[PDB]
Amino acid sequence: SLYPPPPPYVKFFTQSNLEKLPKYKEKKAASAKEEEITCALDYLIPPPMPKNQQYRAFGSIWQENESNYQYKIQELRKLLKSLLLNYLELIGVLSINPDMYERKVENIRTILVNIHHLLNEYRQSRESLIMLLEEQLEYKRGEIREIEQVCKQVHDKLTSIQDTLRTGS
Amino acid sequence: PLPTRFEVELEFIQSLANIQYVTYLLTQQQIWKSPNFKNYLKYLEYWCNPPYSQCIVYPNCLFILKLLNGFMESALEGLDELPKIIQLQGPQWMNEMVERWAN
Amino acid sequence: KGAVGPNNFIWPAEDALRRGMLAMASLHSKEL
């Protein structure tokens, strides 16, 4: 069907199984002193994390104070200059002998592809943390400073009123 | 190879986010009538803590199951209103998820 | 919107679940 069937073990665990789970896990721990499914109550025991700390799904694999970059910068600049130079040479190829133009085209793309690699090491979450950091920091400083400004102006008004009433005495 | 129970339970949890899946599951009588399914739903609650929460793909179902948790004391009735209510309350629920995680 | 791009949706894809190994796992639930 369109919707896959519920998992099979879901139907094994009734309320009686839930209430008898404590004694079952106590007995299992006492006896113990891929997990084989010898009893229907085994699944409620929390599954163990794989030792390799890896998870595979759909053909793809998955697994501290914030809780020479100049070399990369100059590499990027020289790569951009070389990319412009190669673009000029490739368009010249198109001009004179376009029949073999593709011979350079993908080459240029490789440099562009390398640029993407040069982005990968530069990857930005810390920079986003920084920018959010300063925006809420400056917002709270603005709120604070307007608080002492308003309380100070109220106090100044109170002192002026006190002087006015003392003069009228 | 045969996938482990981790993979199937995680995929079930992430598929619970679909409104069509929830509507289909609640359409059948014996799914809600059987206490086994709700027992499994309450068993699934323990994935809201790390490091299990680091392995999720769509955080919305995190509330949905919790919303489904509410369904055990709110009633089936309300199945018809489920798509409308999720569409209407998507903004504030996304905001509260962001507050729970992004802050 | 009209171009169905793979592996990037807001909600879990129905085709992703169909192609996921959970489908055959449910089919091979007897073998489990």
Binding site: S1, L2 | L79, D80, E81, K84 | E14, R18
Partner: peptide, 25 residues
């Protein structure tokens, strides 16, 4: 003429009961 028209009694909240099954290829 027409004494009174009918009040709109639409029920979009109705979930419908369309059976879906031939999705697998």
């Amino acid at each position: 003429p027409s004494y009174s028209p009918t009040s709109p009694s639409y029920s979009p909240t109705s979930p419908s009961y369309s059976p879906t099954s031939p999705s697998y290829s």
